Design an enzyme around this catalytic site. Structure first.
Site, PDB file in Angstrom:
ATOM      1  N   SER A 151      -1.036  15.706 -11.852  1.00  0.00           N
ATOM      2  CA  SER A 151      -1.342  15.336 -13.223  1.00  0.00           C
ATOM      3  C   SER A 151      -1.610  16.581 -14.044  1.00  0.00           C
ATOM      4  CB  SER A 151      -2.556  14.394 -13.278  1.00  0.00           C
ATOM      5  OG  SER A 151      -2.962  14.161 -14.618  1.00  0.00           O
ATOM      6  N   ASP A 165       0.826  -1.203   0.000  1.00  0.00           N
ATOM      7  CA  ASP A 165       0.000   0.000   0.000  1.00  0.00           C
ATOM      8  C   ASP A 165       0.861   1.254   0.000  1.00  0.00           C
ATOM      9  OD1 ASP A 165      -1.939   1.979   0.356  1.00  0.00           O
ATOM     10  OD2 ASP A 165      -2.324   1.478   2.454  1.00  0.00           O
TER      11      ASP A 165
END
Ligand SMILES: COC(=O)[C@@H](N)Cn1cc(Br)c(=O)[nH]c1=O
Length: 330
Positions: free
Chosen positions: A199, A35
């Site tokens: 992004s 994770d």
């Protein structure tokens, strides 16, 4: 040194991925959920409340000659989906795909929430976010990656998740046969303890690319792609019959639909998520309503590039003194 391990979807929907991990001497092999959105390595154990264990493989420190109780140390964590666990701490030898760390903090669960109990395939989590998020008290502990880093050929690990198929976690090297084209690297902020990046925008299907900054985290421990409501609305508007359902808890769509792809930007580069990756099947058995793999982050407080996004790419987690993230198509 290097390590290389295969990671396998736990079910037919890729809800999560498990990777075998050797703990203790002699080795006890547990299947852990790697994770990158948390920083605790915790396991089901001989100390876990008996009623809260249902099929998992447990770690028994008393059977490990290298296990040492970390005196006075406790841990307690709660995740984004509302699940939680807690217990005490051992140090022991931990190996992943041939890469060995001695004196790794292995957090032994005394309590786990129902969702962990109900998932027989996941024996614990191995956190790969930054060690500043580790919950061990009163002395915070380091992640497996932070402990291994100095010994690695290169201070990196890579995530190569499969769609309905096995994939790979590598430590210490970049497998140049595992991706196409080039790897595009992008800046990371560690201010919140995550692999946080920005992004450069998105496209829906064959639509035009929208240039817009989307701050979010690369999180292998989260199934879905969570993005701003504007973006998610734009995606599902291209699917006939799709709608947001408060009763279901997100966007659903007719199972007869053909889903468009979703593209996200990494600098000037583009990663394309095929439409099928966004299908998470009937909301309940036999239903003709399907759950969407792209959901709004509005209620979360942070955008999350989870497995839906990451499994479309070869992803480099560069743990150099100034960390960066790399994405390649594959
Ligand atoms: C145990 O894994 C699951 O239940 C999956 N749904 C993946 N997952 C696990 C955790 Br913890 C979380 O906060 N979000 C998430 O999507």
């Amino acid at each position: 040194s290097t390590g290389s391990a295969t990671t396998t979807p736990i079910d037919s929907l890729d809800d999560a991925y498990i990777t075998p991990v050797q703990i203790g001497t002699p080795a006890q092999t547990l299947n852990l959920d790697f994770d990158t959105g948390s920083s605790d390595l915790w396991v089901f154990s001989s100390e876990t409340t008996a009623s809260e264990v249902d099929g998992q493989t447990i770690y028994t420190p008393s059977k490990s000659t290298t296990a040492k109780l970390l005196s006075g140390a406790t841990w307690s964590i709660s995740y984004g989906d509302g699940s939680s666990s807690s217990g005490d701490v051992y140090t022991d030898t931990v190996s992943v795909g041939g890469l060995t760390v001695t004196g790794q903090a292995v957090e032994s669960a005394k309590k786990v929430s129902s969702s962990f109990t109900e998932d027989s395939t996941i024996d614990g989590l191995l956190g790969l976010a930054f060690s500043t998020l580790n919950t061990v008290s009163p002395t915070q502990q380091k992640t497996f990656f932070d402990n291994a880093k100095a010994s690695l050929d290169s201070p990196v690990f890579t995530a190569d998740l499969g769609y309905h198929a096995p994939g790979t976690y590598n430590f210490g090297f970049i497998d140049t046969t595992a991706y196409t084209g080039s790897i595009t690297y992008t800046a990371v902020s560690t201010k919140q303890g995550f692999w946080e990046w920005t992004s450069t925008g998105y496209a829906v299907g064959s639509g035009t690319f929208k240039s817009t900054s989307i701050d979010g985290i690369a999180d292998t421990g989260t199934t879905l792609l969570y993005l701003p409501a504007t973006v998610v609305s734009a995606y599902w508007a291209q699917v006939s019959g799709a709608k947001s359902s408060s009763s279901v808890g997100g966007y659903v769509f007719p199972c007869s639909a053909t889903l468009p792809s979703f593209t996200f930007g990494v600098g000037s580069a583009r990663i394309v998520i095929p439409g099928d990756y966004i299908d998470f099947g009937p909301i309940s058995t036999g239903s003709s309503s399907c759950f969407g793999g792209i959901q709004s982050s509005a209620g979360i407080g942070i955008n999350i590039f989870g497995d839906v996004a990451l499994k479309a790419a070869f992803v480099v987690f560069n743990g150099a003194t100034t960390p960066t993230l790399g994405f390649a198509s594959k």
